[PDB]
Enzyme design. Structure first.
Site, PDB file in Angstrom:
ATOM      1  N   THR A   1       0.823  -1.203   0.000  1.00 48.98           N
ATOM      2  CA  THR A   1       0.000   0.000   0.000  1.00 48.98           C
ATOM      3  C   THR A   1       0.861   1.258   0.000  1.00 48.98           C
ATOM      4  O   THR A   1       1.978   1.258   0.519  1.00 48.98           O
ATOM      5  CB  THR A   1      -0.945   0.037   1.215  1.00 48.98           C
ATOM      6  OG1 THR A   1      -1.695  -1.183   1.277  1.00 48.98           O
ATOM      7  CG2 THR A   1      -1.906   1.212   1.107  1.00 48.98           C
TER       8      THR A   1
ATOM      9  N   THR B   1      -3.133   0.080  -3.512  1.00 51.88           N
ATOM     10  CA  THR B   1      -2.536  -1.142  -3.006  1.00 51.88           C
ATOM     11  C   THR B   1      -2.583  -2.334  -3.928  1.00 51.88           C
ATOM     12  O   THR B   1      -3.565  -2.516  -4.646  1.00 51.88           O
ATOM     13  CB  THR B   1      -3.146  -1.548  -1.638  1.00 51.88           C
ATOM     14  OG1 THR B   1      -2.467  -2.695  -1.124  1.00 51.88           O
ATOM     15  CG2 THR B   1      -4.634  -1.828  -1.711  1.00 51.88           C
ATOM     16  N   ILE B   2      -1.512  -3.138  -3.899  1.00 48.38           N
ATOM     17  CA  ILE B   2      -1.551  -4.492  -4.441  1.00 48.38           C
ATOM     18  C   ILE B   2      -1.553  -5.531  -3.306  1.00 48.38           C
ATOM     19  O   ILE B   2      -1.348  -6.736  -3.543  1.00 48.38           O
ATOM     20  CB  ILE B   2      -0.405  -4.789  -5.442  1.00 48.38           C
ATOM     21  CG1 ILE B   2       0.973  -4.643  -4.793  1.00 48.38           C
ATOM     22  CG2 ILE B   2      -0.501  -3.894  -6.670  1.00 48.38           C
ATOM     23  CD1 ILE B   2       2.117  -5.044  -5.706  1.00 48.38           C
ATOM     24  N   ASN B   3      -1.791  -5.042  -2.084  1.00 54.27           N
ATOM     25  CA  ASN B   3      -1.875  -5.831  -0.843  1.00 54.27           C
ATOM     26  C   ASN B   3      -0.518  -6.176  -0.243  1.00 54.27           C
ATOM     27  O   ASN B   3       0.133  -5.288   0.284  1.00 54.27           O
ATOM     28  CB  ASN B   3      -2.817  -7.044  -0.929  1.00 54.27           C
ATOM     29  CG  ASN B   3      -3.125  -7.638   0.462  1.00 54.27           C
ATOM     30  OD1 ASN B   3      -3.017  -6.951   1.483  1.00 54.27           O
ATOM     31  ND2 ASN B   3      -3.477  -8.911   0.504  1.00 54.27           N
TER      32      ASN B   3
ATOM     33  N   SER C   1     -11.037  -3.326   3.768  1.00 52.62           N
ATOM     34  CA  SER C   1      -9.719  -2.685   3.723  1.00 52.62           C
ATOM     35  C   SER C   1      -9.500  -1.820   4.949  1.00 52.62           C
ATOM     36  O   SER C   1     -10.445  -1.231   5.481  1.00 52.62           O
ATOM     37  CB  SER C   1      -9.607  -1.808   2.468  1.00 52.62           C
ATOM     38  OG  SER C   1      -8.392  -1.076   2.473  1.00 52.62           O
ATOM     39  N   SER C   2      -8.244  -1.713   5.369  1.00 50.89           N
ATOM     40  CA  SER C   2      -7.873  -0.822   6.467  1.00 50.89           C
ATOM     41  C   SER C   2      -7.623   0.589   5.992  1.00 50.89           C
ATOM     42  O   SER C   2      -7.456   1.481   6.800  1.00 50.89           O
ATOM     43  CB  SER C   2      -6.641  -1.350   7.183  1.00 50.89           C
ATOM     44  OG  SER C   2      -6.937  -2.633   7.701  1.00 50.89           O
TER      45      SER C   2
ATOM     46  N   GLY D   1      -1.222  -2.120   6.581  1.00 55.01           N
ATOM     47  CA  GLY D   1      -2.082  -3.120   7.178  1.00 55.01           C
ATOM     48  C   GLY D   1      -3.151  -2.525   8.062  1.00 55.01           C
ATOM     49  O   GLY D   1      -3.725  -1.475   7.764  1.00 55.01           O
TER      50      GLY D   1
END
Ligand SMILES: N[C@@H](CCC(=O)N[C@@H](CS)C(=O)NCC(=O)O)C(=O)O
Ligand SMILES: CC(=O)N[C@@H]1[C@@H](O)[C@H](O)[C@@H](CO)O[C@H]1O
Ligand SMILES: *[C@@H]1O[C@H](CO)[C@@H](O)[C@H](O)[C@H]1NC(C)=O
Ligand SMILES: *[C@@H]1O[C@H](CO)[C@@H](O)[C@H](O)[C@H]1NC(C)=O
Ligand SMILES: *[C@@H]1O[C@H](CO)[C@@H](O)[C@H](O)[C@H]1NC(C)=O
Ligand SMILES: *[C@@H]1O[C@H](CO)[C@@H](O)[C@H](O)[C@H]1NC(C)=O
Ligand SMILES: *[C@@H]1O[C@H](CO)[C@@H](O)[C@H](O)[C@H]1NC(C)=O
Ligand SMILES: [Cl-]
Ligand SMILES: [Cl-]
Ligand code: NA
EC number: 3.4.19.13
Lengths: 189, 342
Positions: free
Chosen positions: A1, A19-21, A71-72, A94
């Protein structure tokens, strides 16, 4: 992120989190196009997978075709009563994104730290499960003491907690900060 | 510098990308043109973090209309996904099956359609250059590269760009991304449609499926970024705070801040260790209460969250939680009433 904060000359503003996580997402790179593909499917809850000891899956966040995973992220813009932007802020990292974004706002808006200090100031995190307060390495150790005498079990983050980019309106103009934890630097005119 | 600017500013997690955003502003771009230009760059310099294989949210404030909006361009589960598709974390984290439908480019396109002042191709130009010419690996990427050295060094298609002499690049070493440069060029000239229903589409599908994925051309054709005209807001003194609702964590953030605003923190709250310790304890307890409610959140198009979210943005609800915060102790997990059902 990664988080990005922008204020233009006319006073319009963009807070953008993308993001791509996980680091390098799915680890699938296209040899032809060079695109690195996300592993955002991992943000869904699964009934089979147990992430944390004693923590059940969340049925509200199970996979369905067409559904978006929880999502956070929380890219944020604070605007004054006069319609002028006061703060553009957001974070990467995260479940720590929300608490770190909270912290930066608290630091600037209430404690009165300038934007750079607000970004660089040590952070801490607790997400209920797991049942532990994580503090950054250079946190005021009187804070650590105050938490431990109050029965918090603290532990020290091996790296750092979140990454915050922020812009704040000042008398001088727009004060901007990028988090030294990742090595960004702002720019403007 | 000290980073106070008279007219405009861009704060990104790589210097070169803040500069690219700034130049775009300087050339007459809106805040959105700048954001897009900088994001394209961040997708290169912080390739581990984000890029056109992923998804995004933009919170946008227009000073003319004095209205705020959100653009939801987060990935979605493919049409063939199902609840029980994964049986290990490994399966949901590595390989094509872990891939959701990317929304990034559609998101850029919608934001640009609504707020763009520069040509679409102009937003890609400096990133195309950067990816061909190369750049020194920065602090963030270097540490990501180290953290994942094993997995990267043993995957040839990743090593191709992220290794030098079969070892991950280190800080300061030059990274070039020539394939992405071409892809960005195609996007600049053919537009967003090249990704979702155009010249890139079949190859995207082929790459995902060859890695075990189940994304199909149809998934890409059907992806839509979404305009949210009324984002979440809370009142904070004389200010309003705009943030995204579920599926993002605006509701959690709102709850944290509504709980804490009843304490009227100020400079005095951190002046002595007695105050400072109490202040940080209260902050952590607010985290805990906010995260208790988080477990009922999900995509509001699939799960009814309107009530949960109403509670999370309510000051009275927050006050009820604040009153359960003990100044002298933290509590067991059950005390915060985390919920996993309704
Ligand atoms: N996909 C998650 C966020 C994933 C995330 O933030 N991952 C980490 C890498 S594991 C990250 O960017 N950490 C902060 C950093 O080190 O830059 C969400 O949408 O809530
Ligand atoms: C390369 C690609 O995906 N092309 C598709 C085409 O197959 C489909 O019939 C059409 C429907 O709108 O959209 C586009
Ligand atoms: C996991 O198990 C379910 C139920 O048996 C099955 O349908 C699915 O294909 C499995 N997934 C993987 C990735 O092995
Ligand atoms: C603000 O709104 C105007 C008029 O509705 C629109 O044309 C423009 O794209 C917006 N301006 C910015 C800087 O986003
Ligand atoms: C906050 O959101 C709700 C619903 O749209 C409403 O009370 C109000 O219009 C919003 N406030 C602002 C300042 O936009
Ligand atoms: C919202 O809060 C009230 C108490 O303030 C509670 O009675 C109600 O159950 C809550 N609704 C949900 C869905 O949690
Ligand atoms: C959680 O942590 C606190 C102190 O860290 C403690 O009161 C409690 O016993 C722990 N366990 C549970 C299950 O809440
Ligand atoms: Cl970031
Ligand atoms: Cl490449
Ligand atoms: Na700064």
């Amino acid at each position: 992120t990664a988080h990005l904060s922008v204020v233009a000359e006319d006073g319009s503003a963009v807070s953008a989190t993308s993001t791509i996580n996980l680091y390098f997402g799915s680890k699938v790179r296209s040899p032809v196009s060079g695109i690195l593909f996300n592993n955002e499917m991992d943000d869904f809850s699964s009934p089979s997978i147990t992430n944390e000891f004693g923590v059940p899956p969340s049925p509200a966040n199970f996979i369905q075709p067409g559904k978006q995973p929880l999502s956070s992220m929380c890219p944020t813009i604070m605007v004054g009563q006069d319609g002028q932007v006061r703060m553009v802020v957001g974070a990467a990292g995260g479940t720590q994104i929300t608490t770190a974004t909270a912290l930066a706002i608290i630091y600037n808006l209430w404690f009165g730290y300038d934007v750079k200090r607000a970004v660089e100031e040590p952070r801490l995190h607790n997400q209920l499960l797991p049942n532990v307060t994580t503090v950054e390495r250079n946190i005021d150790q009187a804070v650590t003491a105050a938490l431990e005498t109050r029965h918090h079990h603290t532990q020290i983050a091996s790296t750092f907690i979140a990454v915050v980019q922020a812009i704040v309106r000042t008398a001088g103009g727009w004060a901007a900060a990028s988090d030294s934890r990742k090595g960004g630097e702002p720019a403007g005119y | 510098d000290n980073h106070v600017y008279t007219r405009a500013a861009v704060a990104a997690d790589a210097k070169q990308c803040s500069k690219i955003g700034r130049d775009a502003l300087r050339d007459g771009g809106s805040a959105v043109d700048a954001a897009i230009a900088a994001l394209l760059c961040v997708g290169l310099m912080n390739a581990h973090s984000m890029g056109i294989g992923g998804g995004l949210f933009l919170t946008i404030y227009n000073s003319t209309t004095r209205k705020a909006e959100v653009i939801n361009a987060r990935e979605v589960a493919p049409r063939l996904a199902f609840a029980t598709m994964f049986n290990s974390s490994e399966q949901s984290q590595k390989g094509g099956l872990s891939v959701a439908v990317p929304g990034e480019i559609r998101g850029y396109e919608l934001a640009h359609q609504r707020h763009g002042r520069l040509p679409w191709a102009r937003l890609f130009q400096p990133s195309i250059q950067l990816a061909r010419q190369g750049f020194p690996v920065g602090k963030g990427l270097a540490a990501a590269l180290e953290n994942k050295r094993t997995v990267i060094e043993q995957q040839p298609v990743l090593c191709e760009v992220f290794c030098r002499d079969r070892k991950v690049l280190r800080e300061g070493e030059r990274l070039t991304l020539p394939q992405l440069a071409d892809t960005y060029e195609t996007l600049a000239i053919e537009g967003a449609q090249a990704f979702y229903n155009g010249s890139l589409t079949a190859q995207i599908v082929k790459d995902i499926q060859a890695a075990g994925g189940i994304v199909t051309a149809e998934d890409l054709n059907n992806y839509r970024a979404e305009l949210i005209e009324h984002p979440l807001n809370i009142s904070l003194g004389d200010a309003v705070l705009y943030m995204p609702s579920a599926p993002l964590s605006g509701p959690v953030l709102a709850l944290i801040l509504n709980i804490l605003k009843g304490y009227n923190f100020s400079r005095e709250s951190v002046e002595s260790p007695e105050q400072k310790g109490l202040t940080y304890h209260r902050i952590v307890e607010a985290f805990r209460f906010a995260y208790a409610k988080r477990t009922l959140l999900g995509d509001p198009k699939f799960v009814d969250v309107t009530e949960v979210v109403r509670n999370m943005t309510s000051e009275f609800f927050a006050a009820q939680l604040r009153a359960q915060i003990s100044d002298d102790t933290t509590h067991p997990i059950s005390y915060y009433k985390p919920e996993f059902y309704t």
